[PDB]
Design an enzyme around this catalytic site. Structure first.
Site, PDB file in Angstrom:
ATOM      1  N   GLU A  90       1.945  -8.127   5.112  1.00 38.60           N
ATOM      2  CA  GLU A  90       1.813  -9.352   4.482  1.00 38.60           C
ATOM      3  C   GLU A  90       0.215  -9.411   4.767  1.00 38.60           C
ATOM      4  O   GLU A  90       0.017 -10.344   3.643  1.00 38.60           O
ATOM      5  CB  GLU A  90       2.273 -10.315   4.119  1.00 38.60           C
ATOM      6  CG  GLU A  90       4.143 -10.226   4.087  1.00 38.60           C
ATOM      7  CD  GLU A  90       4.960 -10.580   4.235  1.00 38.60           C
ATOM      8  OE1 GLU A  90       5.731 -12.278   4.345  1.00 38.60           O
ATOM      9  OE2 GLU A  90       6.345  -9.602   5.040  1.00 38.60           O
ATOM     10  N   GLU A  96       9.382  -7.175  10.624  1.00 43.91           N
ATOM     11  CA  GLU A  96       7.926  -6.924   9.608  1.00 43.91           C
ATOM     12  C   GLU A  96       7.792  -5.652   8.855  1.00 43.91           C
ATOM     13  O   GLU A  96       6.923  -5.529   7.354  1.00 43.91           O
ATOM     14  CB  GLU A  96       7.054  -7.709   9.870  1.00 43.91           C
ATOM     15  CG  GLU A  96       6.866  -9.452   9.812  1.00 43.91           C
ATOM     16  CD  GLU A  96       5.944 -10.330  10.992  1.00 43.91           C
ATOM     17  OE1 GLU A  96       5.456  -9.561  11.594  1.00 43.91           O
ATOM     18  OE2 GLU A  96       5.999 -11.340  10.545  1.00 43.91           O
ATOM     19  N   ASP A 144     -23.286  -2.080  -0.347  1.00 47.61           N
ATOM     20  CA  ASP A 144     -24.004  -2.959   0.382  1.00 47.61           C
ATOM     21  C   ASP A 144     -23.325  -3.754   0.685  1.00 47.61           C
ATOM     22  O   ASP A 144     -23.111  -3.650   2.158  1.00 47.61           O
ATOM     23  CB  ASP A 144     -25.297  -3.119  -0.107  1.00 47.61           C
ATOM     24  CG  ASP A 144     -26.270  -2.239  -1.149  1.00 47.61           C
ATOM     25  OD1 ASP A 144     -26.068  -1.296  -0.101  1.00 47.61           O
ATOM     26  OD2 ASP A 144     -27.274  -2.134  -1.114  1.00 47.61           O
ATOM     27  N   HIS A 161       3.657   2.285  -1.331  1.00 44.57           N
ATOM     28  CA  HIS A 161       3.149   2.334  -2.781  1.00 44.57           C
ATOM     29  C   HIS A 161       1.604   2.079  -2.771  1.00 44.57           C
ATOM     30  O   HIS A 161       1.105   3.081  -3.626  1.00 44.57           O
ATOM     31  CB  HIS A 161       3.103   0.303  -2.996  1.00 44.57           C
ATOM     32  CG  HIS A 161       2.321  -0.109  -4.213  1.00 44.57           C
ATOM     33  ND1 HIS A 161       2.364   0.636  -5.145  1.00 44.57           N
ATOM     34  CD2 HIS A 161       1.727  -0.902  -4.410  1.00 44.57           C
ATOM     35  CE1 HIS A 161       1.525  -0.045  -6.116  1.00 44.57           C
ATOM     36  NE2 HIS A 161       0.998  -1.173  -5.356  1.00 44.57           N
ATOM     37  N   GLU A 190      13.784  -5.598   2.589  1.00 44.35           N
ATOM     38  CA  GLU A 190      13.114  -5.392   3.583  1.00 44.35           C
ATOM     39  C   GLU A 190      13.843  -5.865   4.363  1.00 44.35           C
ATOM     40  O   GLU A 190      13.818  -5.115   5.442  1.00 44.35           O
ATOM     41  CB  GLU A 190      11.781  -6.432   3.484  1.00 44.35           C
ATOM     42  CG  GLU A 190      10.873  -6.489   2.333  1.00 44.35           C
ATOM     43  CD  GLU A 190       9.267  -7.000   2.984  1.00 44.35           C
ATOM     44  OE1 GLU A 190       8.844  -7.967   1.949  1.00 44.35           O
ATOM     45  OE2 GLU A 190       9.098  -8.006   3.989  1.00 44.35           O
TER      46      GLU A 190
HETATM   47  C1  HEM Z   1       3.880  -6.055  -9.096  1.00 42.35           C
HETATM   48  C2  HEM Z   1       3.757  -4.651  -9.296  1.00 42.35           C
HETATM   49  C3  HEM Z   1       2.735  -4.440  -8.478  1.00 42.35           C
HETATM   50  C4  HEM Z   1       1.999  -5.256  -6.725  1.00 42.35           C
HETATM   51  C5  HEM Z   1       3.902  -5.904  -6.460  1.00 42.35           C
HETATM   52  C6  HEM Z   1       1.469  -3.774  -6.055  1.00 42.35           C
HETATM   53  C7  HEM Z   1       1.346  -4.786  -4.907  1.00 42.35           C
HETATM   54  C8  HEM Z   1      -0.097  -3.957  -4.063  1.00 42.35           C
HETATM   55  C9  HEM Z   1      -0.589  -4.460  -2.793  1.00 42.35           C
HETATM   56  C10 HEM Z   1      -0.163  -5.862  -1.757  1.00 42.35           C
HETATM   57  C11 HEM Z   1      -1.352  -3.400  -2.528  1.00 42.35           C
HETATM   58  C12 HEM Z   1      -2.668  -3.735  -1.235  1.00 42.35           C
HETATM   59  C13 HEM Z   1      -4.210  -4.768  -1.450  1.00 42.35           C
HETATM   60  C14 HEM Z   1      -4.500  -4.069  -2.407  1.00 42.35           C
HETATM   61  O1  HEM Z   1      -5.659  -3.115  -2.348  1.00 42.35           O
HETATM   62  O2  HEM Z   1      -5.093  -4.303  -3.563  1.00 42.35           O
HETATM   63  C15 HEM Z   1      -1.754  -3.239  -3.489  1.00 42.35           C
HETATM   64  C16 HEM Z   1      -3.111  -2.098  -4.057  1.00 42.35           C
HETATM   65  C17 HEM Z   1      -3.486  -1.139  -5.048  1.00 42.35           C
HETATM   66  N1  HEM Z   1      -2.246  -1.342  -5.973  1.00 42.35           N
HETATM   67 FE1  HEM Z   1      -0.179  -2.061  -6.789  1.00 42.35          FE
HETATM   68  N2  HEM Z   1       1.163  -3.670  -7.459  1.00 42.35           N
HETATM   69  C18 HEM Z   1       1.632  -3.770  -8.255  1.00 42.35           C
HETATM   70  C19 HEM Z   1       1.543  -2.946  -8.827  1.00 42.35           C
HETATM   71  C20 HEM Z   1       0.307  -1.657  -9.346  1.00 42.35           C
HETATM   72  C21 HEM Z   1       0.463  -0.536 -10.458  1.00 42.35           C
HETATM   73  C22 HEM Z   1       1.274  -0.781 -12.231  1.00 42.35           C
HETATM   74  C23 HEM Z   1      -0.257   0.134 -10.373  1.00 42.35           C
HETATM   75  C24 HEM Z   1      -0.923   1.618 -10.886  1.00 42.35           C
HETATM   76  C25 HEM Z   1      -0.087   1.677 -11.911  1.00 42.35           C
HETATM   77  C26 HEM Z   1      -0.876   0.123  -8.950  1.00 42.35           C
HETATM   78  C27 HEM Z   1      -2.149   0.414  -7.849  1.00 42.35           C
HETATM   79  C28 HEM Z   1      -2.417  -0.247  -6.745  1.00 42.35           C
HETATM   80  C29 HEM Z   1      -3.751   0.664  -6.199  1.00 42.35           C
HETATM   81  C30 HEM Z   1      -4.527   1.771  -6.942  1.00 42.35           C
HETATM   82  C31 HEM Z   1      -3.783  -0.055  -4.998  1.00 42.35           C
HETATM   83  C32 HEM Z   1      -5.256   0.240  -3.790  1.00 42.35           C
HETATM   84  C33 HEM Z   1      -4.496   1.469  -3.576  1.00 42.35           C
HETATM   85  C34 HEM Z   1      -6.151   1.272  -2.330  1.00 42.35           C
HETATM   86  O3  HEM Z   1      -6.968   1.535  -3.365  1.00 42.35           O
HETATM   87  O4  HEM Z   1      -5.525   1.634  -1.383  1.00 42.35           O
HETATM   88  N3  HEM Z   1      -0.304  -1.345  -8.837  1.00 42.35           N
HETATM   89  N4  HEM Z   1      -0.811  -3.186  -5.017  1.00 42.35           N
HETATM   90 MN   LIG Z   2       8.266  -9.127   5.702  1.00 45.69          MN
END
Ligand code: HEM
Ligand SMILES: [Mn+2]
Length: 462
Positions: A282, A271, A201, A319, A256
């Protein structure tokens, strides 16, 4: 307790209400932890360890108390109390001589997962992660003060046969908009599974909305009956991934820069090269929705890739798209695809002297000793964290583009051999270009382990 849908915590009754009284905080709803102390323990004597845990259970609040605190803060700016989290490893169950959760990844331990995740060998991990770990303690709060206090109370209770084999400190980062970020400068932790109806909600009422993306997740996507508890029908826990991930910010920013140059990008639009790696700018405006930053009032999450099936806005290998295709993955039905999604509860570590979002050249960014204490709760480690890392991130084939080609590895967390990838230089158009090089790996796994946060009733019963 019905594990098939979300729960309305405010009107829960019977077993569901009991479950909340016996559940640790931070699981169904993240706990504030801008200052976080992590303690890895070793059990020298079984009887003494059981006594220790018993005493810890005395310092612990329930999921429900935590939720009340959250509600109180919103309503009246109330501060709430510190978070004391407790997890046990399979080895720690063995030392205690207790029936253990049966997830096979949990049982084998993270050291055994090294091959399938393409992790660095254990011999390359930091020293404390090479040791046999029985337990983890999480002490978290908005400020350092009450963490210090809690630590002293934990210490007071600690016998000599319960050693601290390792420690980490988390320090939360925020941007000028007040959103939490990771070391590369990007808003992190925006997109979370919501297990509580009250959270769904809230998401609907106070963000861009939930029209395009439903963030709901059934309780079964995180909760697991606590097998050694007095009553597993109401006593629940969750599996916990801890992985220390070092971020070479310097190299990531060079990357980048080089991709932008490669793609002929110009001006501020340079960017967008970074956005292509992450899937958000960012700030972090979703690259699938905008060609440039500015949509952080607030940061949105109400989008899918259904108008981006060709990846000409957000690349297939970005990612967030790798790690949540939001129904566009192509390998299974959307309803099954989303079962791999998980609750992330990580915290950044390290101190730096540069504003992570300041306009500075790559050489002024740290290259080591900062990064992410990656943390997540899973009800099924193989099907959630490991699936996402192995079958999605590391997989050159995923997600499936309509042309049947292989988009390659997740550039942010992908492990194993990498190759140059394809990008659309022009947002939303069919122009395609192959970079001159693979994006260099700027994230390094330094060590980690798998745990289970058991129910409070289990901990008291020891
Ligand atoms: C240094 C390592 C990592 C960095 C710098 C990083 C960075 C980010 C960033 C910037 C986002 C977008 C913000 C958000 O939606 O919360 C994100 C989302 C996400 N990350 Fe990572 N992350 C890392 C490690 C991981 C790992 C190891 C996993 C899984 C094995 C993971 C899974 C996810 C998932 C599932 C999302 C949300 C995707 C979505 O629902 O749209 N992250 N991460
Ligand atoms: Mn940048």
């Amino acid at each position: 307790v019905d594990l098939s849908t979300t729960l309305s915590w405010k009107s829960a009754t019977g077993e569901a209400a009991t479950m909340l009284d016996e559940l640790q905080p931070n699981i169904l709803k993240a706990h504030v932890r801008d200052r976080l102390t992590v303690l890895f323990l070793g059990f020298g004597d079984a009887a003494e360890a059981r006594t220790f845990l018993n005493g810890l259970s005395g310092l612990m609040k329930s999921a429900r108390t935590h939720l009340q605190e959250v509600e109180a803060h919103k309503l009246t700016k109330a501060v709430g109390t510190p978070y004391l989290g407790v997890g046990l490893t399979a080895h720690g169950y063995a030392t205690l001589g207790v029936t253990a959760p049966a997830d096979p990844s949990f049982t084998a331990g993270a050291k055994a997962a090294v091959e399938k995740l393409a992790d660095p060998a254990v011999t390359e991990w930091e020293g404390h992660y090479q040791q046999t770990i029985d337990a983890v303690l999480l002490l978290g709060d908005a400020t350092a003060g009450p963490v210090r206090t809690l630590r002293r109370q934990v210490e007071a209770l600690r016998p000599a046969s319960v050693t601290v084999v390792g420690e980490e400190s988390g320090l939360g980062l925020a941007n000028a908009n007040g959103d939490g970020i990771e070391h590369f400068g990007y808003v992190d932790g925006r997109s979370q599974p919501l297990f509580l109806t009250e959270d769904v909600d809230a998401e609907r009422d106070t963000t861009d909305g939930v029209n395009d993306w439903d963030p709901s997740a059934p309780l079964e996507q995180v909760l697991v009956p606590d097998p050694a508890a007095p009553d597993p029908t109401v006593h629940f826990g969750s599996y916990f991934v801890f992985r220390k991930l070092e971020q070479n910010v310097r190299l990531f920013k060079e990357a980048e820069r080089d991709l932008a140059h490669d793609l002929g990008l110009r001006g501020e639009d340079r960017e967008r090269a970074g956005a292509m790696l992450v899937g958000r700018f960012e700030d972090g405006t979703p690259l699938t929705a905008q060609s440039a930053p500015g949509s952080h009032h607030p940061v949105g999450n109400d989008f899918s890739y259904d108008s981006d099936k060709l990846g000409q806005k957000c690349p297939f290998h970005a990612h967030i798209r790798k790690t949540n295709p939001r129904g566009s993955g192509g390998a299974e039905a959307p309803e099954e695809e989303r079962k791999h999604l998980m609750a992330r509860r990580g915290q950044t570590y390290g101190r730096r002297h540069d504003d992570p979002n300041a306009d500075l050249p790559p050489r002024l960014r740290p290259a080591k000793d900062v990064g992410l204490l990656f943390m997540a709760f899973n009800s099924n480690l193989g099907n959630q964290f490991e699936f996402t890392q192995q079958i999605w991130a590391n997989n050159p084939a995923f997600p499936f583009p309509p042309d049947g080609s292989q988009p390659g590895l997740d550039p942010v967390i992908g492990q194993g051999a990498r190759a140059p990838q394809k990008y659309a230089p022009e947002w939303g158009h069919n122009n395609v270009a192959e970079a001159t090089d693979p994006i260099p790996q700027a994230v390094t796994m330094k060590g980690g382990e798998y745990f289970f946060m058991p129910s409070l009733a289990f901990l008291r019963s020891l």
